[PDB]
Amino acid sequence: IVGGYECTKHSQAHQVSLNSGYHFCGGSLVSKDWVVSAAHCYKSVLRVRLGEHHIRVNEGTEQYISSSSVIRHPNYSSYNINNDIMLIKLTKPATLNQYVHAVALPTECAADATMCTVSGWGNTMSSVADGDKLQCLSLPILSHADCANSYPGMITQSMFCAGYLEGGKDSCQGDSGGPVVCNGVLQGVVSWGYGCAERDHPGVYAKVCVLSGWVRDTMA
Ligand SMILES: [Ca+2]
Ligand code: NA
């Protein structure tokens, strides 16, 4: 997260870190047994770390649970990063408490201009903001018109742009798979973008409200 602010510790209780001996992607807990992330973050086996704030300091609030199954959306495409979403089933249910909680899945898409929050342990491009501590950023959903202006022929109906066209604030590498929550509902998954925080290069996110049908069916 570039140009954001350190999240209040555990305020994004749904935020999890996908680990394989190190942090490589973010994710969102949606139930005691399931985590939603980006399909391009796929790995057959993943160690899901919940209740984290500083990923390199044992805080006593963490839960480390290995995946039992990792499932990419059936229509995911590694060519255009279409339908970039996947589910991770935990080998054992996570315990919900003050530091670990699931975020609601959407049943209603959000309108353009809606203010949301994106978070992650990704690059900050700064020494002032330590990416090892969960970073937060308030950002508005951008119109498809602006998205298509910025990324000609790359934006599908399962994607949406969010951020600042003037640049300076944006999600970044390492934030991938992470959450974009709007009014307490998970509306996006950090997917891709051209560089980070660059003018006219807003972040592109998987549109969960269009992909939630698949998520719900797979969880049941
Ligand atoms: Ca920690
Ligand atoms: Na798969």
Swiss-Prot record:
Belongs to the peptidase S1 family. The record marks D170 as: Required for specificity. PROSITE patterns: TRYPSIN_DOM (PS50240), TRYPSIN_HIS (PS00134), TRYPSIN_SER (PS00135). It comes from the Eukaryota. The active site is at H40 (charge relay system), D84 (charge relay system), S176 (charge relay system). The keyword Metal-binding does not apply. It comes from Gadus morhua (Atlantic cod). GO terms for molecular function: serine-type endopeptidase activity. The keyword ATP-binding does not apply. One of its GO terms (biological process) is digestion. This is Trypsin-1. Coiled coil: none annotated. Its EC number is 3.4.21.4. It catalyses: Preferential cleavage: Arg-|-Xaa, Lys-|-Xaa. It is an enzyme of class 3 (hydrolase).
